[PDB]
């Protein structure tokens, strides 16, 4: 019926976008920490704001300071405080810059941005098992962003169908910002899996190594979800297996 895969991931799935069919599921209903996968919801809300004439790509914003030393940040590697919304959006999606994400959320709704993330989750049809806590996906006061592979499929599918141009950014192995700095994608499978054009990585000790992949072949798009794989390499090895199933 559905194949017998041996994955590192503790929860994993791959789905057909066209009709929603699950082609493989493992712990698909299990609530899991999702870390920087949260940035897909922040991206959705940024893209909505621009379409709705509520945000401009050329607004210049100041990077928020992170109190977490170990968190990936745009400021740490550039020492530049002020960036365009375009460049912050690119940094968030490409290198998983937590400060860029927090800065965008602040601009959109101040301290109430997590409430807007969860409002959008509901509006889009995600289940009660999903809760966002921050624009970046960094923990807040001991609370973690969590979801399921089923809900992450829905978020990713809605993001891609509503804003197909997101893949213009997530398909790039390197992004040259408008400021000038070049940012490197965390998606190591770009150029390794034919048709793969997204979507987003995540990693903390608690969440393990995570990846939402998407690829289109012959007019058929699939979305793969990998949560809590054991190494960075393993999340992508798992994704290779899921993509094989997805296009079988
Ligand atoms: Mg809208
Ligand atoms: Mg759009
Ligand atoms: Mg663990």
Q: 156: which 2 tokens?
A: 């990713």
Resolution in A: 1.5
Beta strands, E only, the chain: 11-16, 22-26, 32-33, 60-62, 82-84, 146-147, 174-176, 182-184, 196-204, 208-217, 220-229
Phi, psi for residue 62 in degrees, rounded to 5: -100, 125
Q: Give the Å distance between the CA of 43 and the centre of ligand 2.
A: 10
- Estimate to the nearest angstrom the gap between the alpha carbon of 74 and the chain centroid: 17
How does DSSP assign 167-194, residue by residue?
Answer: HHHHT-SEEE-SSS-EEE-S-TTTTTST
Q: Binding site annotation covers 216? A: no
Q: What is the CA radius of gyration of the chain?
A: 17
Catalytic site residue 192?
Answer: no
Q: Binding site annotation covers 163? A: yes
Task: Name the residues around ion ligand 1, CB cutoff 5 A.
Answer: 48
Q: 20: which 2 tokens?
A: 């929603």
Q: Give the Å distance between the CA of 49 and the centre of ligand 3.
A: 36
Q: Binding site annotation covers 51? A: yes
Q: Which residues of 35-47 are buried (b: 16+ CB within 10 A; e: fewer)?
A: bbbbbbbbbbbbb
Quote helix, strand, coil % in the chain, to nearest 5.
40, 25, 40
Q: Give the Å distance between the CA of 12 and the centre of ligand 3.
A: 15
Domain containing 13: what range?
1-248
Looking at 38, 73, 90, 96, which residue is catalytic? 96
Phi, psi for residue 77 in degrees, rounded to 5: -95, -10
Q: Give the Å distance between the CA of 89 and the centre of ligand 2.
A: 12
Question: Phi-psi category of 110—alpha, beta or left, where left has phi over 0 and alpha has psi -120 to 50?
Answer: left
How many helices (H) and strands (E) in the chain?
8, 11
Catalytic site residue 224?
Answer: no
**Strand, helix or coil for residue 244:** helix
Q: Which H or E run contains 231? A: none
Catalytic site residue 134?
Answer: no
Looking at 36, 90, 136, 224, which residue is catalytic? 36
Q: Give the Å distance between the CA of 40 and the centre of ligand 1.
A: 15
CA distance 239 to 245: 10
In this structure, which ligand is nearest to the CA of 207?
Answer: 3
What's the 3-state SS for 148-173?
CHHHHHHHHHHHHHHCCCHHHHHCCC
In this structure, which ligand is nearest to the CA of 57?
Answer: 2
Cβ-based burial of 21 (10 A; exposed 0-12, middle 13-18, buried ≥19): exposed
Q: Binding site annotation covers 115? A: no
Tally of domains in the chain: 1
In this structure, which ligand is nearest to the CA of 164?
Answer: 2
Q: Give the Å distance between the CA of 94 and the centre of ligand 2.
A: 17
């Amino acid at each position: 019926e559905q194949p017998n895969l041996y994955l590192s991931a503790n929860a994993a799935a791959v789905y057909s976008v066209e009709n929603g069919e699950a082609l493989y599921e493992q712990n698909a209903d299990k609530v899991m920490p999702i870390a920087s996968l949260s940035k897909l919801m922040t991206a959705f809300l940024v893209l909505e704001a621009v379409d709705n004439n509520e945000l401009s790509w050329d607004e210049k914003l100041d990077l928020v300071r992170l109190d977490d030393p170990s968190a990936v940040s745009l400021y740490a590697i550039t020492q530049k405080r002020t960036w365009s919304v375009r460049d912050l959006y690119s940094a968030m999606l490409t290198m998983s810059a937590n400060d860029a994400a927090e800065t965008l959320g602040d601009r959109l709704d101040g301290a109430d941005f997590p409430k807007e993330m969860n409002n959008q989750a509901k509006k889009l049809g995600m289940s009660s098992k999903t809760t966002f806590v921050s624009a970046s996906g960094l923990d807040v006061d001991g609370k973690s962003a969590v979801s399921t592979t089923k809900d992450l499929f829905l978020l990713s599918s809605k993001l891609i169908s509503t804003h197909p141009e997101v893949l213009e950014t997530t398909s790039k192995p390197t992004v040259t910002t408008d400021k000038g700095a070049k940012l490197e994608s965390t998606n190591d499978l770009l150029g390794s899996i034919q048709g793969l054009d997204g979507l987003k990585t995540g990693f903390t000790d608690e969440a393990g190594y995570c990846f939402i992949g998407t690829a289109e072949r012959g007019g058929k798009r699939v979305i793969s979800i990998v949560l809590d794989a054991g190494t960075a390499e393993k999340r992508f090895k798992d994704t290779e297996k899921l993509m094989e199933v997805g296009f079988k």
